[PDB]
Design a protein around this nucleic acid. Structure first.
Length: 50
RNA sequence: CCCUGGUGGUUAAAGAAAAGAGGAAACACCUGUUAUCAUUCCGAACACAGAAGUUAAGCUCUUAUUCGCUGAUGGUACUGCGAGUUCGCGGGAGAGUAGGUUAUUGCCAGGG
């Protein structure tokens, strides 16, 4: 099988193998962060997670 | 203060064309080349000497926006970033369209 195609295919399969549950957790976190940022003049605690 | 003439600032056509209104003052057209001046020839422009006449033109004002110029709100193109992917967040045209536009203003002189 040709190397160009198999590299494309392997990369596409890795990309597509993401879990919707994890995506939903990330979406929930993003929504929470945007809601907090929408505020103004409050003390906020920032954790680094990535 | 206002009209007119001259001189600045504020730059969005503060643009040209067509039609109408005036001209007291001011301005312009207009008179003569003969005096200094100018033209690669020509008082046309300019230069000089003056006021007989006029709104015709330039100019000012009023006009349909006829040409131009300017321009929405949305939408789209495009773009930053993202463990949401033809998506999530942020910014947002050009063009087109509803429209709008023939300025405004500081201070010198003449007199209404």
């Amino acid at each position: 099988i040709k190397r160009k195609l198999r590299l494309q295919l392997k990369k596409a399969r890795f990309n597509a193998s993401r879990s919707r549950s994890k995506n939903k957790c990330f979406i929930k976190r993003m929504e929470n962060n945007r809601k907090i940022i929408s505020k103004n003049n409050i003390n906020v605690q920032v954790f680094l997670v990535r």
